[PDB]
């Protein structure tokens, strides 16, 4: 019974989900109105894929 | 010195119309260019209409649509505008003032220079209930 001593190539493959939740950057930057710089606006960003 | 003194306000049921006015001194009318504004009590001040020097744009603001009829007289120089159809989002505090005078900063230059006119602030209350 003998062991491998065999060599193969082997090859590289990464794997993940689609994007499924995008980041609304649009909503900040191709906008409407913007508040002055005195009341800057504020606005919060988590669980997204930005 | 300049003032401008705001008047009007006062609690009002909504789905009814009111006005107000702002009676401005120590400048000539057609100097500058004049307007309202609106303070939400939680949010910053707002533009919601202002009339032209000599009455050209007198554009106003799509927030409050078309509930609107602003109208300055030069005789006292003063400045008036009305609600209608009021809703409680109309519920806030109203200002005056009126422009022309903008800081001139250069490149690293000074900040410091002439700025506008403001007034006083009168508060509008819109709610279906009644008062005391």
């Known amino acids: 019974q003998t062991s491998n001593f065999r060599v193969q190539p082997t090859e590289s493959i990464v794997r993940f989900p689609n994007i499924t939740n995008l980041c609304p950057f649009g909503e900040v930057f191709n906008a409407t109105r913007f508040a002055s710089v005195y009341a800057w606006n504020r606005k919060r960003i988590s669980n997204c894929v930005a | 010195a300049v003032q401008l003194v705001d008047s009007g306000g006062g609690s009002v049921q909504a789905g009814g119309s009111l006005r107000l006015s702002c009676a401005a001194s120590?400048?000539?009318?057609?100097?500058?260019?004049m307007g309202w504004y609106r303070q939400a009590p939680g949010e910053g001040l707002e533009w919601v209409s202002g009339?032209?020097?000599?009455?050209?744009?007198?554009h106003y603001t799509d927030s409050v649509k078309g509930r609107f009829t602003i109208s300055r007289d030069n005789a006292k120089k003063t400045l008036y505008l009305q609600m209608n159809s009021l809703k409680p989002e109309d519920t806030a505090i109203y200002y005056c003032?009126?422009?022309?005078?903008?800081?001139?900063?250069?490149?690293?230059?000074?900040?410091?220079?002439?700025?506008?006119?403001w007034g006083q602030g009168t508060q509008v209350t819109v709610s279906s209930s009644g008062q005391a």
């Open positions: 120590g400048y000539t009318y057609s100097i500058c260019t």
């Open positions: 003032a009126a422009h022309g005078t903008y800081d001139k900063y250069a490149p690293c230059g000074g900040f410091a220079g002439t700025y506008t006119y």
């Open positions: 009339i032209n020097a000599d009455g050209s744009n007198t």
